[PDB]
């Protein structure tokens, strides 16, 4: 459910995201702006959400939203260099 998934990402609620993923929710669903849970969590600086989505849920690390922003772009723009470092571990090398 887009609304539940992206608002849980927004508030940093890893416990809810775990319950969603365990019940087979698609953790890569997108809204009308082509935003993912990983975009929203990266923009808010929620390091533990970002790690959970990347490591446990295996989401795409570089989805592009309506403006072609990736989660890495959001982390830099909003000053979350800790999130940036986690995303960097997934780069095309």
Q: Name the residues that contact its own copies, by CB under 8 A.
A: 1-3, 6-7, 9-10, 31-33, 35, 40, 43, 66-67, 77
* 34 interface partner picked from Cl ion, Na ion, its own copies, none, CB below 5 to 8 A per type: Na ion
Closer residue to Cl ion in complex, CB, 18/63: 63
Give 11 or 89: the residue with its C-beta nearer to its own copies: 11
The vertex-75 CA angle with 78 and 48, nearest 5°, equals: 115
Calculate the alpha carbon distances from 83 to 20, 43, 59, 75, 78 in Å. Answer: 22, 9, 15, 6, 10
């Amino acid at each position: 459910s887009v609304i539940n998934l992206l608002f849980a990402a927004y508030t940093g609620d890893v416990s809810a995201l775990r319950r969603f993923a365990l019940s087979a929710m698609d953790m890569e669903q997108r809204d009308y702006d082509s935003r993912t849970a990983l975009h929203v969590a990266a923009a808010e600086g929620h390091v533990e959400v970002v790690k959970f989505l990347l490591e446990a849920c295996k989401v795409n690390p570089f989805p592009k939203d309506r403006w072609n922003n990736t989660p890495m772009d959001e982390a830099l723009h909003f000053g979350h260099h800790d999130v940036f470092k986690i995303l960097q571990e997934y780069q095309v090398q």
